[PDB]
């Protein structure tokens, strides 16, 4: 048995991304097509956070921000993310710890390469 | 000896009608650190309305935050007995991915919620 399993191998690499300038109604479109709770937020590459379907309840609705407003005023990190050479064991416990599902996966460069998700586990 | 429902539920209930705001229903989430909430016409339980529910079937809609919940809420919803034996309801939750169960007597009137 040669090695503990990285997140490389457990990962999605078929990302579905949002930017921070489309809106909090797109973000819920897509939640509801994927059937996730949690989206990278990103230009490109570029990983600004995540944001979930409860961050969209006590952050935006809960303060009379409406659907047609930009994602990017209620992204709040830092994001939890993690190398795709991790050991996926440590990067479990560290998504048990913040209680998150999902956690973006970057490169050494911190570019954007997959997503982990405990389903993934 | 068998632990019932009504020995781990809370019976401090908040719950929210169907002519109040998504607003109101976010910001109730928020303040009680919950993800769901009873749904209730009187003493008429109607569903739970869950963060997510808010999201997929609102937001995603372009619902505006004031307008009222009605028909958010889709169910049946999970609902206990207060004298149902906790292990077996937690078991439910835990296959259903539910964190929260309303609780009745038995005439159906909300009595508590069930949380874990
Ligand atoms: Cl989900
Ligand atoms: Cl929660």
Same mark, same amino acid.
């Given at each position: 048995?040669?090695?503990?399993?990285?997140?490389?191998?457990?990962?999605?690499?078929?990302?579905?991304?949002?930017?921070?300038?489309?809106?909090?109604?797109?973000?819920?479109?897509?939640?509801?097509?994927?059937?996730?709770?949690?989206?990278?937020?990103?230009?490109?590459?570029?990983?600004?956070?995540?944001? #979930?379907? /409860?961050?969209?309840?006590?952050? $935006?609705?809960?303060?009379? *921000?409406?659907?047609?407003? &930009?994602?990017?005023?209620? +992204?709040?990190?830092?994001?939890?993310?993690?190398?795709?050479?991790?050991?996926?064991? #440590?990067? /479990?416990?560290?998504?048990?710890? $913040?209680?998150?599902?999902? *956690?973006?996966?970057?490169? &050494?460069?911190?570019?954007? +390469?997959?997503?982990?998700?405990?389903?993934?586990?």
């Amino acid at each position: 048995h040669h090695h503990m399993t990285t997140v490389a191998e457990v990962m999605t690499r078929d990302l579905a991304t949002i930017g921070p300038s489309q809106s909090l109604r797109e973000a819920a479109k897509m939640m509801d097509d994927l059937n996730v709770g949690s989206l990278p937020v990103c230009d490109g590459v570029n990983l600004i956070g995540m944001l #979930t379907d /409860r961050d969209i309840v006590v952050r $935006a609705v809960s303060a009379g *921000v409406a659907p047609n407003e &930009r994602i990017e005023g209620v +992204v709040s990190g830092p994001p939890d993310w993690c190398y795709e050479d991790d050991d996926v064991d #440590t990067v /479990r416990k560290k998504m048990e710890e $913040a209680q998150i599902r999902r *956690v973006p996966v970057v490169d &050494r460069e911190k570019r954007l +390469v997959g997503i982990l998700s405990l389903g993934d586990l």
